[PDB]
Ligand binder design. Structure first.
Ligand SMILES: [Pt+2]
Length: 816
């Protein structure tokens, strides 16, 4: 609501444009944030709304030199497809192959000596003093290459040089221009002086530079396109046509229509045939069927659906034809929300990613300075102290004087050094790994958002679980109802009816269960009236019940915890004090009933802890992560459930009001704490925590407090979320090393420092060793896709043997 804009930018090729754009925008006044995604080719900028407008931002971007526009909503396939660039680079490589074969054949013909040559390689027979026929062929071919093959690089360098910054094609244009001009000058000098020998010239490298450049830039885009498979599959999964039906009286088909999604609205009725996708989320009206959504939520078992259930826009129907009423259409569907969340997942760049952006904006000038320094130092060392170099070039050649060999060596070693740098491999090391990790997570239910939580989960030491809806099933079962007061004037029917009618006003999770229970044993569909319903969260409810004859034909009611009756001034007895103890330490909480000050009786209410809770708590304990449980229930109830799962420290009697101070005090020691909440209920608690985990939120992934969202209601996915985040963060570190070892080794070698050992590279060898670098970085990222989701028996394996039981004695409780 702060005028936060999202833009799409076309034309970002080099990895150095991101730093330029971000610095130019942030340095401009009135802007506090700017994130640019090279892979997605978009931008996310927030600013002060009144000072500047979106058109001003577009104008600034156009001034920088990029074409930008407002973000579109549905069309994203071509951005993530990379079709145009792959096709163009493949076409360019095939086009440039026609001039790489002849020069390569001529070069290889020179090297291998024939055992019985026809004339002993007279292909270098001079015709005009200084101009051999070989050099004529090479000159013609190189002129055609420069006037026909390097045009695109010339255009890119010209458009980048119009502004202060320099992209990565400057290196290519400089290399080719120098290798052309020096050779042309030396050839003209040789011809004019009428020398007998044609000097060795630099007319062979431009033909071999462009072939390797195009091959590298084609393979690199072909490898990139495999990183966006998850987004491509998710986006190209929603349907575009629906079968609109109209119901006369008894859901009878009046008529049929086919409508696009942009015209269908909420409340419409649509039918699906077997084998067809559900176009819109909605409520099942009639018909029994079952559908599988393994491409949406990641589960393998196909869910069964009955009239009155919900559907997911994207699942495939199997049995029969079913009519449903549309509820969410368009951007409101779960699939659209998932796609959007994953899209802005690659926007919050990590600090290491920001450093990598900063380093790659100051790379090309560094390479140019290093190349010029190498050229000058080689010339001066050759011209001043020839002894050191002639120790390794001792041969005296009459055809070319020793002055001319030093210059040629200096030029060769100053061209190879700037022809071997690979800024792109350093630029795209981390973004590809981040994208692949997020996609492989999203295809498994875990819905990690943002790049910061990726490395946040690496160093978390304490995890925090809530009780209801997170550890246990969340749908409580009523065990039994006990009566403590009178039986004649307070029969079972009366007390259950009045408590059910009293709680019917409320919506607290445990009370709806007891109300529906009361309905099911009394068998009465009617109910009375409740008035003066005082509802204090975390304390209890107090009210009065009227119209008590509705159910009894077949009243100040105070319901709450023990202190709730203390607040209303009700006495303390001993038989009631140990009444729930028989059940309280068995893991079922108990609610006490007192109407008009009369201790009517007690009810035991239970909710079963999920099976997975036994192992998920232990794996984190063995993985090096501590665990703490928090709840607002009684201390004895927390103690019982803590032992059943194995958490030593618990925070009980926490009223739902504060629930942030306990998180606050844990973070006060400098450690990192992440809480596993439930969603809309515990939004303030998740936001304060460093990483928010929202578990069991099906088709409600639009959560802003939490930075990690889990669709399936499984505690083991918490383990997989941490276990997969570590496996990703390690990949950036490995990727950022291969881009530094290669550069800090390929520069000295191309600088000719290894001359005494006797290893020197011609420039064409300085490009074939660069195209392999860019692809190798991407190929190291794609290895993450080989990730099998661990199964229940998988965790049973490494956890087998050692499961240490614990008793309530070694269980601490809260403080204050
Ligand atoms: Pt380059």
């Amino acid at each position: 609501s702060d005028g936060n804009i999202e833009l799409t930018i076309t034309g970002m090729t080099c990895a150095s444009c991101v730093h330029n754009i971000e610095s130019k925008l942030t340095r401009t006044n009135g802007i506090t944030y700017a994130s640019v995604a090279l892979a997605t080719s978009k931008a996310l900028v927030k600013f002060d709304p009144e000072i500047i407008g979106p058109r001003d931002i577009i104008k600034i971007i156009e001034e920088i030199g990029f074409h930008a526009s407002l973000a579109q909503r549905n069309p994203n396939a071509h951005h993530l497809d990379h079709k145009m660039e792959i096709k163009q680079w493949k076409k360019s490589f095939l086009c440039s192959l026609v001039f790489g074969i002849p020069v390569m054949a001529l070069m290889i013909y020179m090297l291998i000596p024939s055992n019985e040559p026809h004339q002993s390689m007279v292909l270098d027979h001079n015709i005009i003093p200084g101009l051999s026929i070989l050099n004529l062929i090479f000159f013609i071919l190189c002129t055609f290459v420069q006037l026909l093959g390097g045009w695109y690089f010339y255009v890119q360098a010209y458009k980048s040089l119009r502004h202060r910054s320099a992209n990565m094609d400057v290196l290519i244009v400089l290399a080719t221009s120098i290798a052309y001009v020096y050779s042309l000058v030396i050839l003209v000098v040789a011809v004019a002086e009428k020398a007998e020998r044609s000097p060795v010239t630099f007319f062979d490298t431009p033909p071999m530079l462009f072939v390797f450049i195009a091959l590298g830039r084609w393979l690199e885009h072909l490898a990139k396109s495999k990183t966006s498979e998850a987004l491509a599959k998710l986006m190209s999964l929603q349907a575009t046509e629906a079968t609109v039906v109209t119901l006369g009286e008894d859901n009878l088909i009046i008529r049929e229509e086919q409508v696009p999604m942009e015209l269908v609205q909420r409340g419409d009725i649509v039918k699906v045939v077997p084998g067809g996708k559900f176009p819109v989320d909605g409520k099942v009206l009639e018909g029994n069927t079952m559908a599988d959504e393994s491409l949406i939520t990641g589960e393998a078992m196909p869910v069964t659906k009955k009239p009155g259930s919900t559907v997911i826009a994207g699942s495939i129907n199997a049995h029969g034809s079913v009519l449903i009423k549309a509820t969410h259409v368009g951007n409101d569907t779960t699939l659209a929300q998932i796609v959007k969340l994953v899209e802005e997942a690659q926007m919050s760049k990590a600090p290491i990613q920001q450093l990598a952006d900063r380093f790659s904006g100051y790379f090309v000038p560094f390479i140019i300075i290093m190349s010029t320094l190498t050229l000058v130092v080689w010339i001066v060392i050759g011209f001043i102290d020839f002894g050191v170099v002639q120790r390794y070039f001792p041969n005296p050649n009459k055809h070319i004087s020793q002055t001319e060999v030093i210059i040629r060596f200096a030029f060769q070693t100053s061209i190879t050094v700037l022809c071997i740098a690979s800024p792109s491999s350093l630029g795209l090391a981390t973004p590809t790994a981040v994208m692949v990790g997020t996609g492989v997570a999203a295809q498994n239910g875990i819905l990690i958002k943002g790049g910061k939580p990726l490395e946040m989960a690496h160093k978390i030491k304490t995890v925090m679980f809530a009780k209801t809806g997170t550890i246990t099933h969340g749908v409580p079962r009523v065990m039994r109802v006990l009566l403590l007061g009178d039986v004649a004037t307070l029969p079972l029917r009366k007390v259950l009816a009045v408590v059910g009618t009293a709680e019917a006003s409320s919506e607290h999770p445990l009370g709806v269960a007891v109300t529906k229970y009361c309905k099911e044993e009394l068998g009465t569909e009617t109910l009375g009236y409740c008035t003066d319903f005082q509802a204090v969260p975390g304390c209890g409810i107090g009210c009065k019940v009227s119209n008590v004859e509705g159910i009894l034909a077949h009243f100040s009611v105070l319901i709450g915890n023990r202190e709730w009756l203390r607040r209303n001034g009700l006495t303390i007895s001993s038989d009631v004090s140990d009444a729930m103890t028989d059940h309280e330490m068995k893991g079922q909480t108990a609610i006490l009933v007192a109407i008009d000050g009369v201790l009517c009786g007690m009810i035991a209410i239970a909710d079963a802890v999920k099976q997975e809770a036994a192992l998920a708590v232990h794996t984190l304990q063995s993985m090096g992560v501590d665990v703490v449980l928090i709840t607002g229930d009684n201390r004895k109830t927390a103690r019982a459930i803590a032992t059943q799962v194995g958490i030593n420290k618990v925070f009980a009697e926490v009223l739902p009001s504060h629930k942030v101070a306990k998180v606050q005090e844990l973070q006060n020691k400098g450690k990192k704490v992440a809480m596993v909440g439930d969603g809309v209920n515990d939004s303030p608690a998740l936001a304060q925590a460093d990483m928010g985990v929202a578990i069991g939120t099906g088709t409600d992934v639009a959560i802003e407090a939490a930075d990690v969202v889990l669709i399936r209601n499984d505690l083991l996915d918490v383990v997989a979320s941490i276990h997969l985040s570590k496996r990703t963060v390690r990949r950036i570190r490995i990727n950022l090393v291969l881009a530094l070892i290669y550069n800090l080794v390929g520069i000295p070698i191309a600088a000719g420092v290894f001359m005494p050992i006797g290893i020197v590279l011609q420039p064409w060898m300085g490009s074939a060793a660069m195209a392999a670098s860019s692809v190798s970085v991407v190929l190291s990222s794609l290895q993450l896709k080989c990730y099998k989701k661990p199964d229940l028996e998988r965790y049973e394996a490494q956890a087998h043997g050692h499961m240490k039981p614990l008793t309530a004695s070694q269980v601490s409780v809260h403080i204050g």
